């Protein structure tokens, strides 16, 4: 089949468009006709989308640039070993960050492949769920509500399609699609790929595949966009710049003191360059990137797709989770089970699912066809007034419409959908809360147009002037309204979604036939996750458009609505401006009868109170709320493609505890970054204080430049990036949600930093004095001082793994990367002491076993002090 342009296919009529593609409009192409056009045209992907460029990309990090400048200066001053050491440090930190980023991106790609784009395609006469990639031209694709168009289609059936094209055209207003050919962007019959179906149903024939799509260049350029830097990454780059600049000032003070007081200028320059490389947090942006990437991988292994990286930082700060009852807190497997007619009879509908199986029983007697008139008109309105179909036991439209269709097929009144010809349709909006169609009968065209309306009880009864009683139409009376409201509240209190139905001539003069109770069971595992998130201090709220009784009963069953809890309507939200809404909104647990405008108002009011809202709603109309929230969560398995396109994060298995896990890794990210910050800052302050005291008090320098560069490799390389790998605990399950502000340098953290630095400096200077008592500066002195500082740093790294828990509690072997890095640093120090060329380049000398034992015992004191402070603080908090 030759490829056809969309404009030509728009001018041309549908019949010939099917002919050129040899398309079967009803049965669809079988596998044989699919295979040939697949071989000719190819698969539907945009063909195929440099690793060395990504490796090079890391070097514009300003701290890495400062280290490169220091290495260049070392090269200029003929310092071979210094330049090699600095370059090795840069290469190892860059390699760590690059490997972590690559692994996270590959895992994210695998998870994205685990959720492929799909569509409803009829091929063998059976409507199946086929991937958008498998489409070949001429295939027949059925478009439902909240569907992303899989390929460029020519719609031969379109009753009330309304498709938004904001991503492609740039206009937010959806455009109606009509199946009539368009003679001579303006294609009102071609459904372009990449747009989303806001409303209505359709069936079309695909006219494009691969690069033949008319508007595929925007999606091509879309992949070439690069994700901007995360706000945490920006703030931690700023923090590293502050730390490097303060250390630069201190090092300049050291160098000026050395020059004015009198020392070797070249030696002071080498020490200054080595100290600048030391105290610059070259591993801080790298550890932030590693923590973010590792959190992405962990929540990928939790079956959650992270579309945007700055969400992982924000899930830790989340404190309120606002969800929808339909599709999020309930499995959305909707079913009509109770009918209350306008007369007063009660009908029980058995069976569950979007099928014809089950019967309507009235007073113990099965009712089919037109045995009971009022139930028959109820079922007829519920069948005709929809835009949903049930084909091959699969639903197309909204589940609440499919429940009515299944009820009609249960009663055998499905053929009444075809008997009525729709000429006027009032499109559903959640603000309206009702829908209506004006139809005429096929067999009796002489009969006047009759309008069917279904919706919320208040909106429907606002348009009803009459009602049915025993088969005759009477004027609607007030006690009839009272008993209808009482029965509606009675079904809603049992967890039934109540739909009111009216059939009559024109609008505003209809007959109220009664109500149907639609059972929507709650989603499994939501109650336990609500309990866990409440125990975590993360409040959970329900925002709905459904009635008070249904929302309250569902929330009571889940557990987010206690006996002493408040529920507020959308109209009360309208009556409350910013000041009252901001104070009432934490008290309310259930928001019912709220339009998406009211949902967005609730999100804005909760965000105004310093809260991080994580909206987990579904629905083709609830997407401005998902984009407006700080975090937008959707359901991968059972969710509209509109939400999954709008969501920031997608749950693959549709599990509410996964949001809790995302919050826990969000907290663990900041915990690990605090660990790195405290370790690096303590050892950097220790080294800076040692050199400052040596220059001020005229002692020989305890450390030389190559020793300071090895101390850099320890303090910013693998021994310190291992602390960003440190696993999450269970305390973050009970920990109060972190403030959205960074506040990285806690006063307690700074106090423990200064404590660790003070013990390290004092012990190292004590060893220096112990071997300097003889007044001869033998390089055994320098090697004892160097080993003392390195072992002090190793014990400081052991201490810095967890701020609160004791080292025995978390486990010495819990962090394998930390153990490997500690062993590597110990081996490197042993080589520096015991390998004669390394001894020559580091100006060291061999040591005795007893001297090493003394150094180990002395350096254990910083770990002992840290453990004592940890135990004291833990006992004080209890």
């Amino acid at each position, epitope marked *: 089949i030759p490829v056809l342009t969309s404009k030509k296919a728009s001018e041309l009529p549908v019949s010939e468009v099917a002919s050129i593609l040899q398309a079967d409009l009803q049965n669809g192409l079988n596998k044989c006709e699919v295979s040939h056009r697949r071989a000719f045209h190819g698969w539907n992907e945009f063909d195929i989308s440099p690793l060395w460029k990504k490796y090079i990309s890391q070097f514009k990090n300003p701290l890495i640039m400062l280290l490169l400048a220091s290495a260049v200066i070392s090269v200029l001053m003929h310092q071979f070993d210094d330049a090699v050491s600095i370059t090795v440090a840069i290469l190892i930190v860059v390699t760590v960050a690059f490997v972590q980023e690559y692994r996270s991106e590959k895992s994210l790609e695998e998870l994205s492949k685990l959720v492929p784009p799909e569509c409803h395609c009829v091929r063998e006469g059976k409507l199946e769920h086929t991937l958008a990639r498998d489409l070949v031209p001429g295939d027949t694709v059925c478009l439902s509500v909240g569907d992303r168009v899989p390929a460029d289609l020519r719609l031969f059936e379109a009753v009330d399609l309304s498709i938004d094209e904001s991503s492609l055209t740039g206009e937010t207003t959806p455009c109606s699609k009509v199946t009539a050919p368009q003679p001579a962007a303006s294609r009102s019959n071609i459904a372009f790929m990449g747009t989303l179906v806001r409303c209505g149903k359709a069936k079309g024939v695909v006219i494009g595949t691969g690069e033949n799509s008319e508007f595929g260049e925007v999606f091509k350029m879309m992949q070439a966009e690069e994700a901007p830097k995360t706000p945490l990454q920006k703030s931690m780059d700023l923090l590293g710049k502050q730390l490097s600049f303060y250390s630069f000032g201190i090092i300049g003070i050291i160098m000026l003191v050395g020059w004015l007081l009198g020392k070797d200028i070249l030696e002071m320059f080498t020490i200054s360059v080595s100290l600048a490389v030391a105290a610059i947090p070259e591993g801080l942006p790298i550890v932030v990137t590693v923590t973010l990437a590792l959190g992405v991988m962990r929540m990928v292994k939790k079956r959650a797709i992270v579309k945007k990286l700055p969400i992982v930082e924000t899930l830790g700060c989340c404190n309120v989770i606002c969800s929808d009852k339909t599709g999020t807190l309930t499995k959305n497997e909707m079913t009509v089970t109770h009918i209350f007619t306008s007369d007063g009879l009660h009908a029980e509908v*058995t069976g569950v699912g979007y099928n014809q199986f089950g019967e309507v029983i009235v007073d113990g007697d099965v009712v089919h066809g037109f045995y009971n008139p009022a139930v028959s008109r109820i079922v007829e309105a519920g069948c005709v007034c929809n835009d949903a179909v049930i084909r091959n036991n699969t639903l197309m439209g909204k589940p609440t419409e499919g429940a009515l269709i299944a009820l009609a097929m249960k009663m055998g009144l499905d053929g009444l959908q075809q008997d009525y010809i729709r000429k006027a349709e009032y499109p559903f909006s959640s603000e309206q809360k009702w829908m209506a169609v004006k139809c005429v009968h096929r067999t009796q065209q002489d009969r006047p147009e009759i309008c069917f309306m279904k919706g919320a009880y208040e909106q429907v009864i606002k348009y009803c002037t009459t009602y049915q009683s025993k088969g005759q139409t009477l004027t609607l009376t007030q006690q009839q309204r009272d008993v209808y409201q009482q029965e509606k509240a009675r079904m809603g209190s049992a967890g039934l979604r109540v739909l009111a139905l009216a059939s009559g001539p024109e609008l505003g003069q209809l007959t109220f036939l009664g109500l149907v109770g639609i059972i929507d069971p709650p989603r499994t595992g939501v109650k336990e996750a609500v309990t866990t998130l409440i125990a975590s201090g993360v409040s959970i709220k329900m925002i709905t458009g459904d009635s008070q009784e249904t929302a309250v009963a569902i929330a009571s069953r889940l557990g987010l609505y206690s006996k002493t809890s408040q529920s507020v309507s959308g109209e009360e939200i309208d009556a409350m401006d910013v000041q009252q809404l901001s104070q009432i909104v934490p008290k309310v647990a259930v928001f019912y009868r709220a339009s998406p405008r009211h949902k967005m108002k609730i999100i804005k009011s909760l965000q105004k109170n310093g809260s991080v809202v994580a909206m987990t709603g579904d629905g083709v109309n609830d997407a401005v709320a998902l984009k407006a929230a700080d975090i937008g969560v959707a359901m991968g398995q059972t969710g509209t493609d509109v939400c999954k396109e709008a969501a920031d994060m997608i749950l693959v298995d549709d599990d509410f505890q996964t949001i809790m896990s995302a919050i826990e890794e969000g907290k663990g990210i900041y915990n690990n970054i605090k660990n790195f910050v405290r370790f690096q800052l303590s050892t950097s302050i220790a080294a800076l204080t040692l050199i400052s005291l040596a220059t001020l008090m005229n002692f020989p320098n305890p450390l030389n430049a190559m020793q300071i560069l090895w101390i850099n490799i320890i303090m910013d390389g693998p021994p310190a990036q291992s602390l960003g790998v440190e696993p999450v605990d269970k305390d973050v399950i009970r920990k109060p949600p972190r403030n959205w502000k960074d506040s990285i340098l806690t006063k307690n953290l700074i106090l423990k930093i200064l404590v660790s630095s003070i013990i390290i400096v004092c012990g190292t200077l004590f060893v220096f004095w112990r071997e300097l008592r003889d007044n001869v500066i033998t390089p055994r002195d320098t090697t004892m001082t160097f080993t003392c500082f390195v072992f002090f740093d190793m014990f400081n790294a052991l201490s810095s793994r967890s701020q609160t828990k004791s080292v025995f509690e978390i486990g010495l072997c819990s962090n394998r990367m930390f153990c490997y890095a500690v062993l590597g640093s110990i081996m490197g120090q042993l080589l520096v002491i015991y390998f004669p060329p390394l001894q020559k380049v580091f100006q060291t000398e061999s040591l005795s076993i007893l001297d090493l034992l003394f150094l180990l015992g002395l350096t254990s004191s910083v770990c002992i002090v840290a453990e004592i402070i940890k135990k004291v603080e833990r006992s004080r908090e209890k």
Partner: nanobody
Amino acid sequence: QVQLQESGGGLVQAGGSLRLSCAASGSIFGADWMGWYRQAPGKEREFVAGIGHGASTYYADSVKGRFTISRDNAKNTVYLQMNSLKPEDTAVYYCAVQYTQYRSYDSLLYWGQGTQVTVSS
């Protein structure tokens, strides 16, 4: 409350004969509807076989003519016999019972834990 326990599921070859039974703790007399439902990955829950109030037997379109369903109040267990089963219609099987209902609106829909049946080529 009557509890439902499923048994009889297991590994079978294509074209063989299989048995299935959901037993009830109480007497199944007033139940106006009782059926079975396949749950399989990538698809929704589908009706298999059931009976209703007027002793009328309901079979799914893709299942009709192969599955035989019976009940007995003496052994209070609903039983299913499958013949000529194919590898492509295997899933996990759930038993559902509904009761008649008046002043409340709560659904008396009782499900079993389910027994998993795997059929290969």
